[PDB]
Structure formats: structure tokens, C-alpha cells
């Protein structure tokens, strides 16, 4: 509609310990549904959405063992990269891996992702063809060369084209009521003096799902302002999201400005402006 299943994996080395901290979170669209944290109480794959609690112990046992296996491999990978970069074992380093599938309205794979970063920088990524890799420096070239030798691409491609899509379909069925919905935003404009003769107008969108949204401001008769303060879309904590966008305008000219709110749940945008009480 479209939809996606994505996993986000993070391994952090700890100079002065054995095991790195290893975390996995899984998402369908904008909803986190599973988490594994090696340092947790306890270190198993566990639910983060009510609807996944529908899976039997077999599911939970198998994902926990896969998480544990991946953690061991990420431990190895961190040590391997220390070597590639000639780095010492007295500092912390990070490996991140994001992967998953986007599927279209007909339930078919639109694109697959499989990419890693070392210390927050692009390391290696599976190309859109799902057949070849992009490296970013000498170390990642070695990794790329190794993955070509063992045909890793075909293993990841098989997953992304098959099980990833199929599991996404299962999850969409399990969590249909919350995943397959649009809650449109409710919006209002607030007014806050900024100086003697300037006012901050803030256009709020609240209670919306999914997270994608766009707010625009403009002076009536002109193109959209670029001079706009925004915040990153943020979780309300109840499965919906919030966002706001602000402009500073002259006192007494508040109503010459208009905010529009666009969202998948709105056939037409909401149109708002400051209304004195």
C-alpha cells in the first residue's frame, strides 16, 4: 500500500569485555514489532507489538537462536575489521546492518535492501539488482570480494525475494487492524510572540499513522516558504505520530499565512491558519 519489513541490527564492541552489545529491532512499516538485546533481562527475541504475540513458541525459539547466532558472527566481524583497519582493541566500534523488503499493492517485491555501516559510515551495500555489491574503501573491498566468492548475493536475494515478502504478508494479516489503517492528522495553528513585532506560528499535526506527512507554510500569493522551522516526526507513544512546522511572521499579519497538511489519510490536504480566540 506500499508496505515493508525491515530489520535494524547493531553491534558495539566494548574494550574490556568479550561479547559486544548486540541489538536487533524489526519493523513492519512504521511499527516496531520485535526486539533482541544481548544485555537484556532477558536476551531473547521478544514482542514489541501486541499482534505478534500471536506467534507460538517455535517462532520465538527460532528467532532467538538466529539472533544469538548473528551476534556471534557480528563479534567475529568486529574483530575482522579491527584487523582490516589496523585498529587497537582499546576502543569501541560499531557495525550496523539494515535489510528488508518493500512490497507493492499487489504483494510483489518492489525493492530489497541489505547494507552495512562501520562506525556510522557506509561500508558495503547490496545493489538494487540484488546481484552485486558496492564497497566504499579498501576494507569493504575485501568484504565485497569475500561475499562474491561465497555468492552471498544469491543467499540474501533469495531471502529478500521469498521469506521476507512472505513473512511481511503474514505480519500484515496478524496486525491488519493497526498496520492496514490510516489515522489522518488532527491539526491546529498556535501563536507565540517572538519579539516586539514578530510572532511564531506553529502548525501542528497530531494523532496520525503512518508516519509520512508533509506540512507546508506560505505567505498567501507566494511560493512555499523555505524559511521554516520543522521538527523530526516524533512518536506520541500510543502508535501515532506528531509533527510541527513553524514560521516567524510580523505581528498583525498572521492571517496572510496558510499551513497545509498532507497525509495518506487525507484525500485533500487540511488547510489552516491562525484564528484569534
Amino acid at each position: 500500500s506500499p508496505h515493508s519489513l525491515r530489520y535494524f541490527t547493531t553491534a558495539v564492541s566494548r574494550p574490556g569485555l568479550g561479547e559486544p552489545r548486540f541489538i536487533i529491532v524489526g519493523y513492519v512499516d512504521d511499527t516496531q514489532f520485535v526486539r533482541f538485546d544481548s544485555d537484556a533481562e532477558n536476551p531473547r527475541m521478544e514482542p514489541r507489538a501486541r499482534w505478534i504475540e500471536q506467534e507460538g513458541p517455535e517462532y520465538w525459539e527460532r528467532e532467538t537462536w538466529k539472533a544469538r547466532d548473528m551476534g556471534r558472527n557480528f563479534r567475529v566481524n568486529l574483530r575482522t575489521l579491527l584487523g582490516y583497519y589496523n585498529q587497537s582493541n582499546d576502543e569501541s566500534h560499531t557495525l550496523q546492518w539494515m535489510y528488508g523488503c518493500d512490497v507493492g499493492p499487489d504483494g510483489r517485491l518492489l525493492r530489497g535492501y541489505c547494507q552495512e555501516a562501520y562506525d556510522g559510515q557506509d561500508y558495503i551495500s547490496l545493489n538494487e539488482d540484488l546481484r552485486s555489491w558496492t564497497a566504499n574503501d579498501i576494507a569493504s573491498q575485501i568484504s565485497k570480494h569475500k561475499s562474491e566468492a561465497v555468492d552471498e548475493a544469491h543467499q540474501q536475494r533469495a531471502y529478500l525475494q521469498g521469506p521476507c515478502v512472505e513473512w511481511l504478508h503474514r505480519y500484515l494479516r496478524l496486525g491488519n487492524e493497526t498496520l492496514q489503517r490510516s489515522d489522518p492528522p488532527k491539526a491546529h495553528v498556535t501563536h507565540h510572540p517572538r519579539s516586539e513585532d514578530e510572532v511564531t506560528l506553529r502548525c501542528w499535526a497530531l494523532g496520525f499513522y503512518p508516519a509520512d506527512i508533509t506540512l507546508t507554510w506560505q505567505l498567501n500569493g507566494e511560493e512555499l516558504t523555505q524559511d521554516m522551522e520543522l521538527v523530526e516526526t516524533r512518536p506520541a507513544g500510543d502508535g501515532t505520530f506528531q509533527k510541527w512546522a513553524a514560521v516567524v511572521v510580523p505581528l498583525g499579519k498572521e492571517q496572510y499565512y496558510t499551513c497545509h497538511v498532507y497525509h495518506e489519510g487525507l484525500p485533500e490536504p487540511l488547510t489552516l491558519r491562525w484564528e484569534p480566540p
Partner: protein, 100 residues
């Protein structure tokens, strides 16, 4: 690593009304590395039981996390989120403003 400095937002789940129970969120984004200390305070004092969730990373590899706690806005009580991260020498306290 290339350190990235956290962006912090402190806000309520529902539009605040004095004496009406609510949820206070501290949402921290765009930081690297992922290790971070987040405390939520009431009148300068550490709030005991704070939940953490929604922790992952963005397309630019930077991390985000949500802390939250139950709270009832009053005319007098002050709330803030104090964040310590390797990218900053000193912790950073962001006070809750009903208008943000």
C-alpha cells in the same frame, strides 16, 4: 567514529491540561555512537521509573530512542530531560515547554 550530536525533543503525548494525567516523552535523535544516558526530571529530581522504547537508526545510520513517563501537568511543577552523550562534554538539559 564520527560522533553526531543528539537532537532532543521533550513533549506530551496529549495536549497538556493542568491536573489532567498525561505522558511525558523525551525523543532523542541523530546521535552516534548509540550509547546514551537519558534521565527525566521533575523539579530537578530524577524521575525513578522511566520506560525506553522505539530504539533504532535512521537511513543516515544515526540513532534514535524514546524515553517516557506518566505525569500530570501542574501550574508549578517543572519537567526536563537530561541527556549525556560522548559527543558532548557536558550533559544537556531540555526543559518541557507546553508550546512545543
Amino acid at each position: 567514529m564520527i560522533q553526531k550530536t543528539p537532537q532532543i525533543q521533550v513533549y506530551s503525548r496529549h495536549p497538556p491540561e493542568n491536573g489532567k494525567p498525561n505522558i511525558l516523552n523525551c525523543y532523542v535523535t541523530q546521535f552516534h555512537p548509540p550509547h546514551i544516558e537519558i534521565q527525566m526530571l521533575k523539579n530537578g529530581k530524577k524521575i525513578p521509573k522511566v520506560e525506553m522504547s522505539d530504539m533504532s537508526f535512521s537511513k543516515d545510520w544515526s540513532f534514535y530512542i524514546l524515553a517516557h513517563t506518566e505525569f500530570t501537568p501542574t501550574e508549578t511543577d517543572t519537567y526536563a530531560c537530561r541527556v549525556k552523550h560522548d559527543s558532548m562534554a557536558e550533559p544537556k538539559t531540555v526543559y518541557w515547554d507546553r508550546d512545543m
